[PDB]
């Protein structure tokens, strides 16, 4: 009956509307993914329930318990029927779930507090005074972990052992750390967020250099899911009619 949608609370994808306290159900939320979910549901003709992933994670497989967490986990163990959020299409995930073609293209990038003397990944790698890290249980950490590229390889050996920990549990925590570390902390995140934050007060962060790779976000469903193929056609249609660019301009519409 009601499709259970798992998504994550990350502006401008999903955020609490003002005065949400007296609101109920899906009306409590607004954002890029909120509108996209509505679109998908409208064209596919089904009711749905937005639910914030319990642990607030994107999705990774515990190196020990070998159990998947985050939104990926919700789909794998059957808690959600579909994930509609900025979930990165990767090999280890495609091995356990299905993704539609990307509804957004992006790449890993570098966020620094304005004034920080670093222009690129090469810059970060050769020094240590300026610390840097990424999010836990995400596609960025994994990217560096599996990279054999000298540049990105060096960076990993540095992060994997840095103390105190350069890793963060949430993205909002990685941004907050840059803003508060007087230039001693650079953050590695996806271009999408780096751009969003650069146009926000106190307008003290910025993206430097080009992206380190080219990937995309896809709508995810349990492996061999029935809704899968239909959702993919729906998404390609929305993109081709220019609605997805419209949504992007709307939510990425200080500094």
Ligand X SMILES: N[C@@H](Cc1c(O)noc1-c1nnn(Cc2ccccc2)n1)C(=O)O
Residue 137 is labelled as binding a ligand: no
Residue 86 is labelled as binding a ligand: yes
Q: Using the rule CB under 6 A, is 251 a contact of ligand X?
A: no
Residue 73 token pair: 């986990």
With CA atoms as reference, report the closest residue to 90 among 133, 146, 132.
146
- What torsion, rounded to 10 degrees, do the Cα atoms 169, 173, 174, 179 define? -160
Among 73, 86, 133, 222, binds ligand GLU (CB under 6 A): 86
Estimate the share of the chain in helix, then strand, then coil, as percent rounded to the nearest 5: 35, 20, 45
Looking only at residues 39 through 68 of this chain, which bind ligand GLU when binding is defined by CB under 6 A? 58
Half-sphere exposure of 125 (CA within 13 A, CB side): 13
Residue 250 token pair: 């709307």
Alpha-carbon distances of 251 from 33, 145, 210, 245, rounded to whole Å: 10, 32, 23, 10
124, interface contact from a second copy, ligand X, ligand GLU, none, CB < 5-8 Å by kind = none
Is 31 or 86 the residue whose CB approaches ligand GLU more closely?
86
* C-alpha span between 115 and 209 (Å, rounded): 14
- Specify the stretch interacting with ligand GLU by CB under 6 A; choose among 35-43, 83-91, 115-123, 158-166: 83-91
State the minimum distance, in angstroms, from the CB of residue 160 to ligand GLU: 15
Interface pattern 174-213 for ligand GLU (x via CB under 6 A): ---------------xx-----------------------
Looking only at residues 111 through 150 of this chain, which bind ligand X when binding is defined by CB under 6 A? 134-135, 138-140
Is 29 or 152 the residue whose CB approaches a second copy more closely?
152
* C-alpha span between 187 and 176 (Å, rounded): 10
- Specify the stretch interacting with ligand GLU by CB under 6 A; choose among 33-41, 42-50, 85-93, 243-251: 85-93
- Specify the stretch interacting with ligand GLU by CB under 6 A; choose among 35-43, 132-140, 162-170, 200-208: 132-140
* C-alpha span between 193 and 205 (Å, rounded): 11
Strands of the chain, DSSP E: 3-7, 15-16, 29-30, 48-52, 82-83, 97-99, 104-106, 108-113, 131-133, 185-190, 205-208, 215-217, 220-222
Among 36, 104, 135, 206, binds ligand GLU (CB under 6 A): 135
Enumerate binding residues for a second copy (CB under 8 A).
89-91, 94-95, 99, 101-102, 104-105, 143, 146-149, 152, 213-216, 218, 232-233, 236-237, 239-242, 245
Enumerate binding residues for ligand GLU (CB under 6 A).
58, 86-88, 135, 138-140, 189-190
Known binding positions for L-glutamate: 86, 88, 93, 139-140, 190
């Amino acid at each position: 009956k009601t499709v259970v949608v798992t998504t994550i609370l990350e502006s401008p994808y999903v955020m609490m509307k003002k005065n949400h306290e007296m609101l109920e159900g899906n009306e409590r939320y607004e954002g890029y993914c909120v509108d996209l979910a509505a679109e998908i549901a409208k064209h596919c003709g089904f009711k749905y329930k937005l639910t914030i992933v319990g642990d607030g994670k994107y999705g990774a497989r515990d190196a020990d318990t070998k159990i998947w967490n985050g939104m990926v986990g919700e789909l794998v163990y059957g808690k959600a029927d579909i994930a509609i959020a900025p979930l990165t299409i990767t090999l280890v995930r495609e091995e356990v779930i299905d993704f539609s073609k990307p509804f957004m293209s992006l790449g890993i990038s570098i966020m620094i507090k304005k004034g920080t003397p670093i222009e690129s990944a090469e810059d970060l790698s050769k020094q240590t005074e300026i610390a840097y890290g990424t999010l836990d249980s995400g596609s960025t950490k994994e990217f560096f972990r599996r990279s054999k590229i000298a540049v990105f390889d060096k960076m990993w050996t540095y992060m994997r052992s840095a103390e105190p920990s350069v890793f963060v549990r949430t993205t909002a925590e990685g941004v907050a750390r840059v803003r508060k570390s007087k230039g001693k902390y650079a953050y590695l995140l996806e271009s999408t967020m780096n751009e969003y934050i650069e146009q926000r007060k106190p307008c003290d962060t910025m993206k430097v250099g080009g992206n380190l790779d080219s990937k995309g976000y896809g709508i995810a469903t349990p492996k061999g899911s029935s809704l899968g193929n239909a959702v993919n056609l729906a998404v390609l249609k929305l993109n081709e009619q220019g609605l997805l660019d419209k949504l992007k301009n709307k939510w990425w519409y200080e500094c």
